[PDB]
Ligand binder design. Structure first.
Ligand SMILES: *[C@@H]1O[C@H](CO)[C@@H](O)[C@H](O)[C@H]1NC(C)=O
Lengths: 22, 40
């Protein structure tokens, strides 16, 4: 999966490691 | 002393189940419980 003035990208609360562990 | 604290995520309780050859578990008693589901 290929990823991609006041605009900020908030990180997700659930990290990839914790999603993988789930 | 009380203040704001920061901790990593509680992924949940860790449960130890043992997969075994020719071994089985079957519930002996049972419990009946009602749960609330709310839909606007
Ligand atoms: C099953 O659980 C109930 C409590 O929910 C208990 O009173 C009852 O004795 C239990 N049955 C057996 C056979 O242990």
């Amino acid at each position: 999966v290929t990823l991609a003035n006041g605009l900020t990208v908030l990180p997700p609360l659930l990290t990839d490691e914790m999603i993988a562990q789930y | 002393s009380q203040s704001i604290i920061a901790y990593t995520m509680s992924l949940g309780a860790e449960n130890s189940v043992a997969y075994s050859n020719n071994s089985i578990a079957i519930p002996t008693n049972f419990t009946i419980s009602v749960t609330t589901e709310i839909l606007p």
